[model samples]
Target: CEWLGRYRIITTESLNLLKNMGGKYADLETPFPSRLYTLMDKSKVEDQVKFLVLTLDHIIHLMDAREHMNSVNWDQNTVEDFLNILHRKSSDLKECVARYAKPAHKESYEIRIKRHFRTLKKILKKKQYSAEAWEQIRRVVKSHLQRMDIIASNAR
Candidate 1:
């Protein structure tokens, strides 16, 4: 019932730490490879798709963190429904991206790309994410943002 995680700007590095904590997105590596960044580098449609997928991925991660809390009681069915929505949305977004993102170098445009991924978690007390995820997420997102700037220039 309560909100899962705090809603705030978290650099991509922070996300990597959260991913390491546990779940589908976790990858143990010295320098983490971000799926979102990869997609962004490829194309605009991919950038949009990556944004949606990352959002859902973050929500799923927060849901897991919520499970660890003893004070908050989540209904099993409701949780299932929420996850299903995330999955469905993820699937739909990917399909759309693949279908519409034709290969083209248009040289001019704008799109919403996040320098930081917003995170949400349900916890009695506020806590920072793992030290590891922050640095990695920050590095990755920053690099991605830089790439975006280059791509933007090329567009014009």
Candidate 2:
């Protein structure tokens, strides 16, 4: 329906926020790890996958904050579909976020990973997300970068 969140016009703001952090890309963290920042970081192949994952989990909080700012209700099948896509991604940003967001040691990555699959399955079953859904959705956002490149290319 309507756009998920407020689409800001500041390209630098959005791009800087979304671009991956740490390692070779850049060592700077976002001024505030906004959803886009978190999402983009997760999307990129960064050394700081853990931080990106944490950022993604933090980004999810934004959805909960709004009464309805881009929401989805994913069922088990839907969750499976989403995870299927996400898990396949070499970067698998959502997977990283889902994995590191839980307690460690006692909570292994596999356990947390399955927990998220089940949790999101239930949430989506009622209202949730799967890596698969994100994989599909990322295509649209991916286009923005292309357009952004064009705009940047034309600027000079």
Candidate 3:
């Protein structure tokens, strides 16, 4: 019944190679340091699950927008696979976070993560979408995937 690390199916390599064949995404020897991505905890784990899901979901949204607007020409199936995989991971994390919900769910404990991360999405989405901007966003999402894998290691 344990779901810990289930969402870890998508790894750094999945992303590293997603747009790589195009010679566009060159993952560096070290992930360029990102304070925005390096940063949160459940009540620390729950917070992280929430954060990870939010981040994953945001990238999903960003991708959708890019594809719709034709901001960057895409190879359809490759982009589809990438977004679909993230959907799987996001759904898995949703199940994990749902365990924290109670009939008497306290707003103070859980909702803050949503508020904060949602706020961040606004901040994150502020920059206009571009091929270059999306590349940077991918790096941020890669960091999220890595951190959530770390958080899952601490779980049941």
Which candidate has the top score in lDDT?
3
**Model 1 lDDT per residue over 1-156, tens place:** 011112122223333443343334323332322544455455654444445455556545444443444433334455555455556555655564555545466322222222233322211123344433433343433344344333333322
Give each model's clash number.
17, 10, 3
Candidate models: Cα lDDT each: 0.40, 0.33, 0.55
In terms of TM-score, which candidate is strongest? 3
TM-score for each candidate, following the candidate numbering: 0.36, 0.22, 0.61
Tens digit per residue, CA lDDT, model 2, 25-139: 3222212213333344334233234432332342233223222313433233433333333233314444444544344354232344334334433443343444333323333
* 10 residues in a row with least lDDT, candidate 3: 28-37
- Ranking, TM-score, top scorer first: 3, 1, 2
TM-score of predicted model 3?
0.61
Off by over 4 Å in 3: 16-22, 26-43, 66-69, 102-128
lDDT: which is higher, 2 or 3?
A: 3
Error of 2 at 113 (Å): 33
lDDT of each residue in 81-135, candidate 3, tens digit only: 7788788778887787787654455544235434544543454356555555555
- Which candidate would rank higher by lDDT, 1 or 2? 1
